[PDB]
């Protein structure tokens, strides 16, 4: 009916488009301001994603506004439904590009955790800045299949917009398959990062327990006076020290060496105990503490903050992914269904609407996840 209709249906509510445009613009501006207040590669990718969403909104909304201003559909206001193609192209173009950006971020997280030494090397900002034009070109080349007799655009509308044709053209199925593959890849990367972060948390908890045992044994040595208790506490401290070095960075070449120095001193103290020197042994323990303050305290602090930031970013990404799923799963499901039925149940429209609200939901969630996010890190 949209293909034959060339006039705006009376009684259609035009406030929805204006509200969505205003909300998207406000969210994009807030996200850009918050990012300008702060760079890491993930933040640059988020900034590029917000900029892409802003460009998509600023290219999509004026067409819908002119459609209401002229009281005519896209086929009527523009000759040979040119806008009905162009708009649709835009409605697909960013819909892929931003999606790809998401994958990139996920891949970054993988390259952040899956390959630590690969990420430790110098990764200049030029790479992140060059990722955006490459993603744009790939998305344009992929969405350039229509208008070349390979794919067609029809009007699945309530009176304002156009989209891809479902039928003999196989571009819609390929686009849905690409979206599903990207979603599966992002989910797999997120689960891998989840498992790696759980392993890191377990290792950090084990190291903290070993450090607490070392401190307790040192306090016992300082408070004890009998040779048997001092020897038992020294044995427990040596066991706890050997149970901590079990977890090839340059700093990792000193930390391990620092433990070797510690254990060695512990052995010395044990020798003193076998010689019957109590006070001397205590002095040795003091030296132990000094070594701890010299070499081990720093590593633990670095491990804590790093992991923290990691988890933060992770949760961010995860939320984003959830959003993307809620926005693209309806569309992929429609693509696989039979066109007849797809119209009979009027499912396609809904999916499209979801896609649209995607441009609203992508930036705002960022402003939702403020730096005071430690509560969520508590889990």
């Amino acid at each position, epitope marked *: 009916d949209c293909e034959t209709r060339q006039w705006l249906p009376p009684g259609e509510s035009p406030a929805i488009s204006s509200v969505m445009f205003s909300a998207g613009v406000l969210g994009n501006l807030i996200a850009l301001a918050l990012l300008a207040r702060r760079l890491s590669l993930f933040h640059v990718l988020v900034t590029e994603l917000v900029f892409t969403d802003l460009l998509g909104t600023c290219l999509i909304s004026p067409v819908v506004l002119a459609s209401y201003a002229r009281n005519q559909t896209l086929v009527a206001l523009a000759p040979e439904s040119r806008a009905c193609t162009y708009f649709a192209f835009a409605m697909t173009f960013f819909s892929l590009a931003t999606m790809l950006m998401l994958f990139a971020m996920a891949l970054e997280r993988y390259l952040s955790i899956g390959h630590p030494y690969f990420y430790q090397r110098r990764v200049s900002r030029s790479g992140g800045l060059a990722v955006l034009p490459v993603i744009y070109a790939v998305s344009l080349l992929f969405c350039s299949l229509p208008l070349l007799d390979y794919g067609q655009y029809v009007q699945y509308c309530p009176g304002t917009w156009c989209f891809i044709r479902h039928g003999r053209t196989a571009y819609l199925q390929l686009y849905a398959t690409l979206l599903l593959l990207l979603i599966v890849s992002v989910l797999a990367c997120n689960f891998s990062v989840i498992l790696n972060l759980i392993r890191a948390r377990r290792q950090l908890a084990d190291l903290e327990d070993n450090w607490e045992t070392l401190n307790d044994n040192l306090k016992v040595i300082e408070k004890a006076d009998n040779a048997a208790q001092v020897k038992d506490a020294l*044995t427990k401290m040596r066991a706890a020290a050997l*149970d901590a070095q079990k977890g090839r960075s340059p700093e990792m070449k000193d930390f391990r060496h620092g433990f070797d120095i510690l254990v*060695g001193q512990i*052995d010395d103290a044990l*020798k003193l105990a076998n*010689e019957g020197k109590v006070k001397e042994a205590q002095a040795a323990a003091e030296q132990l503490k000094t070594t701890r303050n010299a070499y081990i305290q720093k590593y633990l602090e670095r491990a804590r903050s790093t992991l923290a930031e990691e988890t933060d970013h992770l949760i961010l990404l995860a939320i984003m992914t959830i959003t993307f799923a809620v926005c693209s799963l309806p569309f992929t499901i429609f693509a696989y269904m039979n066109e007849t039925s797809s119209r009979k149940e009027k499912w396609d429209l809904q999916a499209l609407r979801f896609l649209s609200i995607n441009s609203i939901i992508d930036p705002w969630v960022f402003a939702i996840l403020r730096p005071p996010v430690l509560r969520l890190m508590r889990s």
Partner: antibody
Amino acid sequence: EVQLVESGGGLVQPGGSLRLSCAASGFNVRSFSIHWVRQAPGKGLEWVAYISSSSGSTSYADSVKGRFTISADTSKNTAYLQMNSLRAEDTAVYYCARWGYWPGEPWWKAFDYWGQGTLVTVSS
Amino acid sequence: DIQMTQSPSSLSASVGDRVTITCRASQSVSSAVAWYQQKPGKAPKLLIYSASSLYSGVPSRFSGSRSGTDFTLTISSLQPEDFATYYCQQYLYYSLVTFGQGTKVEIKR
């Protein structure tokens, strides 16, 4: 290759003294601590004495404190264990071994080479 | 005063069978647990050091594992040359060396 030969074992009357010798071949005793293990007939292994020729510290088992004396000679590259005031429980087999010093891998490989060991029998 | 407790004391099996030996320590030891194989009328020989790696020379049929404070020696396939007594030892310190109670595999019939 790395070999440890024990000698000096045999029959000793109760209350006497016996000198056991452990000779190493293939390495220097100043780079590895020398340990002695005792095994009773129909039983398991048991550490009895240890010496570290790098620093000069010695250690013994709680049951043998005050009766055994271990020493090491770097000029001859060997170890000597003197046993005084023996008892009937000292009928066993002694083995000599080397355990590396702490820094690094040699320490982790504990008792990588075991000697042939010698039999000691204390009976009147 | 670590006292190693070895639960398996007598087990009988044939060639090709899997053998599992468990060693428990009275005190928490990180990795200072080793397994030794002593033949009747012969000197013992180190099989597994640090409970993770394998000794240079011993066959790959023996493996070691750790779970909390319990160490596990696993033999995938028995052979007529692997029928000897097994001992668990702790080497946390030079003066702290305590052996287990022993474990001698037998031929079942």
